[PDB]
């Protein structure tokens, strides 16, 4: 059972949880209700396990793609914003959190990956993936490298895999065919092959994870990385002279990043649903609540209409929304966790060499 009279919130460790905790201190000042923000490891896997038994946090934050599986298992409360509140957020962000016709979470912010480059090392970042090998050969002569990003999570390699034709689930005549998966077609194979060749020719290392790529870019050792808005604040601290721009094309086509909508769901087991609604509607989803989280770690393009004038002053956000314009909003169907687990294993096995590209993607299929 979840404790009555207070709020427990889970949010991923790469987000602005200290800023979110400041919104909870404002909530505690006005109402007396303590808000506890936690960032447990693998929380998108832990939440369905503890929530199924009636435990867990009052509120869970994650990108919208996992909430359909949570909703199918009955783990989420249907939210109840009135029409006036719904008119405060962009319509397409409400579409991201609809499952079986119902609203299952509050949209917070729109996220997309961008190419992040060191202007001192690279004033003209490349427009194509194809020219990165020659750039790396040039920078390696100077003790640098061209590109490092997280190869342990398929979210970061998906824009390249999807560029030439790869897809998750086929959508046709108003519904998905969950048996028609596009992880091993010609387009996906071409993208993953290009990634493996970058590794075979030592332009990247298969072991590179989030922490390693972040450290290398923020110390000026690599000229580019691929990351989302949450990472900009640590780059600001390192004083690297960085820019945010469009992901490179592959075979002449734009990279196709999955677009995520950071969203907040209310635990169906929570006895604090009224408090949770008040916190999310009247404290977080305000100009001053989003500002407080953003000052800690940037959210991206926040879903609240009244903030768009402020977003437009941030050129990193326009770049984020240009990459989102060339991408697709993730499905939220329950099969998404199985899709991600399959792509993650295929990328890791191919990049390491234990399997060829054809063998790995055939196993993901």
């Amino acid at each position, epitope marked *: 059972k979840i404790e009555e009279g207070k709020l427990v919130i889970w949010i991923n460790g790469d987000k602005g949880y200290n800023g979110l905790a400041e919104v909870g201190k404002k909530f505690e000042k006005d109402t007396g209700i303590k808000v506890t923000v936690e960032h447990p490891d693998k929380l998108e896997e832990k939440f369905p396990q503890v929530a199924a038994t009636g435990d867990g946090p009052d509120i869970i934050f994650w990108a919208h793609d996992r909430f359909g599986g949570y909703a199918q298992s009955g783990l989420l409360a249907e939210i109840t914003p009135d029409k006036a509140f719904q008119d405060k957020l*962009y*319509p*397409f962000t409400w*579409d*991201a959190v*609809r499952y079986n016709g119902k609203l299952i979470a509050y949209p917070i912010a729109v996220e997309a990956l961008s190419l992040i480059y060191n202007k001192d090392l690279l004033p003209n970042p490349p427009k194509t993936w194809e020219e990165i090998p020659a750039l790396d050969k040039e920078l390696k002569a100077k003790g640098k490298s061209a590109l490092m990003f997280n190869l342990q999570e398929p979210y970061f390699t998906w824009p390249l895999i999807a560029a030439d034709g790869g*897809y998750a689930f086929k*959508y046709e*005549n*108003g519904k*998905y065919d969950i048996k028609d998966v596009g992880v091993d077609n010609a387009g996906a194979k071409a993208g993953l092959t290009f990634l493996v060749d970058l590794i075979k020719n030592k332009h990247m290392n298969a072991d590179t994870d989030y922490s390693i790529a972040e450290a290398a870019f923020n110390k000026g050792e690599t000229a580019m990385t691929i990351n989302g808005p949450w990472a900009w604040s640590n780059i600001d601290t390192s004083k690297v002279n960085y820019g945010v721009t469009v992901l490179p094309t592959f075979k002449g086509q*734009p990279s196709k990043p999955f*677009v995520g909508v950071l969203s907040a769901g209310i635990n169906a087991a929570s006895p604090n649903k009224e408090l949770a609604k008040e916190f999310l509607e009247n404290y977080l989803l305000t100009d001053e609540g989003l500002e407080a989280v953003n000052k800690d770690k940037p959210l991206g*393009a926040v879903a609240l*209409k009244s903030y*768009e*004038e402020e*977003l*437009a002053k941030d*050129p990193r*956000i*326009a770049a984020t*929304m*240009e990459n*989102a*314009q*060339k*991408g*697709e*909003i993730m*499905p939220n169907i329950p099969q998404m966790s199985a899709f991600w687990y399959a792509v993650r294993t295929a990328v890791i096995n191919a990049a390491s060499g234990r399997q060829t590209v054809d063998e790995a993607l055939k196993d993901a299929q």
Partner: antibody
Amino acid sequence: SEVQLVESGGGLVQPGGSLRLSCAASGFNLSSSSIHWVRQAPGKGLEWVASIYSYYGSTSYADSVKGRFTISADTSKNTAYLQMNSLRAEDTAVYYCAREYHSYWSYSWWPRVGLDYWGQGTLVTVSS
Amino acid sequence: QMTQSPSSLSASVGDRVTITCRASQSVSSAVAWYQQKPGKAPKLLIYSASSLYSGVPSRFSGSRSGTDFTLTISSLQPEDFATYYCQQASLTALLTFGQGTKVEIKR
């Protein structure tokens, strides 16, 4: 099978009057596309009027027509409509219907793309 | 609001032509460009700021620089004298057209 849109219903109407325009689609299923009405007053630029823009059937309107115009559609007839009430002299224009479609749209109709097929337009004159 | 500039520009066959619209208080990259001849319906040129619509000749291209979106015609052809419109789809699901630009024959 060519995609095309055909507007009808234009004519002369008195100020304060009502007029319903029709947009008949062929060569594609209207229910999987977004449908927009755009008008062009004589000698002037393009002005967007109204849209059905989402999988769930959400509509939006320009401020100058809000409360007076209603956009709707009949899926069984593959036809869209613009009901225009309380008309004014300033509503005189050629009225165009146009479709927006992206083959990768799902339940989310993102990203928003271009208006790729337009009709020939129908002329509405409001005058006494 | 999409501020299109200039309202009219004169050019010759073979010129490189540039038209720019500035978006205000907006972060959308859903920006399209249209061409319209007298008496005819508009025709789509560019969408998503920079994607060339299928069948449109290669001399047409779109780009974004901050809040400014630009249509470029690399080598103006005789059939390219017309009026051009920019258009944005806002995140609030509203459409806005620029005022338009007349490309006319210099003499």
